[PDB]
Ligand binder design. Structure first.
Ligand SMILES: CC[n+]1c(-c2ccccc2)c2cc(N)ccc2c2ccc(N)cc21
Ligand SMILES: CC[n+]1c(-c2ccccc2)c2cc(N)ccc2c2ccc(N)cc21
Lengths: 173, 172
């Protein structure tokens, strides 16, 4: 299909993000992906495997973003401003990160979603801890978790300047 | 004690787990332990159960917010007082789980956002006069993450760690 299967994994991601894990059905995914049901059943008779597929696709996207953050943080050479920017870009990219966001929030009370979620907090820590210490590293990721949830809740993100200022206070000393 | 109440509290639970669209008399009958949806139908023929469930959580949220307000006037060290209160909140996850679930969920469900906003708007107005907009907003944001990240990572920031990060953020 040149990627009918890949559209079904990408739909299933959004599905699971919106309805949860035990809220996966072939009908929904076909709807979600705009493909015939038979394509879904043919490629993923077993829904557990569609679940695995959908979580791995998110996990890949998560770790992929993190590596990009890694690349940017070495090169740029200024910490607060870089992190401020990277966060801003992310807060703005509502398309295609909704899901990672839908899942990360859900994981808050859903152990089965935490292996996927912990990649963010663990990954950020590995990135920052060497550069700023672990107390600072933890405090910053705490703030970022807040920045996203707070932005979504209130409907307005912190500006880059506001982010930069708060990061700088958290990393100072 | 009162079966109305037990049904609105169960409905809160169900909304917290299955969203709002997931709410049904049947699910609530189970969560409530009401013998049959029949008591559920009696007290709430239609789903103005949502409105009661949402208002019950609003009342609980405002209430805790009033408690924070009281505890703040009752001391001087703002940072350490906010930390203590948060530490207590993280330690009472069991009491406050449904509120937390609803808050998380509201990130992508606009219908849960009027309830959810009582927190940020509330903390903002509470602290803004003491530390100004910038700091009050930065603290609320940090608190949003303090709870989420504690849940995700399974380890909360300590009182000392909370106090330290808050002190950095409030300082003019
Ligand atoms: C999906 C996790 N997550 C969150 C996040 C999303 C929702 C709530 C809390 C944190 C995040 C939040 C902010 N502000 C900035 C960057 C990231 C991020 C960056 C990379 C990644 N692989 C996951 C990331
Ligand atoms: C339910 C909102 N909420 C959150 C919160 C919960 C989950 C995610 C983000 C913030 C909260 C988080 C921390 N750290 C400390 C206090 C509160 C709080 C306090 C009162 C209230 N009425 C709602 C509150």
């Amino acid at each position: 299909p040149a990627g009918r299967r890949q559209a079904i994994v990408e739909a299933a991601e959004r599905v699971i993000a919106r309805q949860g894990l035990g809220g996966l059905s072939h009908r929904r995914v076909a709807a979600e992906a705009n493909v015939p049901v038979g394509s879904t059943t043919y490629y993923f008779n077993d829904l557990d495997a569609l679940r695995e597929a959908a979580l791995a696709h998110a996990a890949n996207a998560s770790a992929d973003l993190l590596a990009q953050w890694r690349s940017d943080l070495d090169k740029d050479r200024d910490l607060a401003a870089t992190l401020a920017r990277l966060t801003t870009v992310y807060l703005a990219d509502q398309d295609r990160y909704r899901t990672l966001n839908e899942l990360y929030m859900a994981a808050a009370h859903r152990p089965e979603l935490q292996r996927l979620a912990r990649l963010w907090p663990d990954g950020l820590l590995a990135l920052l801890e060497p550069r700023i210490g672990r107390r600072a590293a933890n405090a910053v990721t705490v703030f970022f978790d807040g920045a996203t949830l707070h932005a979504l809740i209130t409907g307005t993100p912190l500006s880059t300047d506001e982010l930069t200022d708060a990061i700088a206070r958290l990393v100072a000393d």
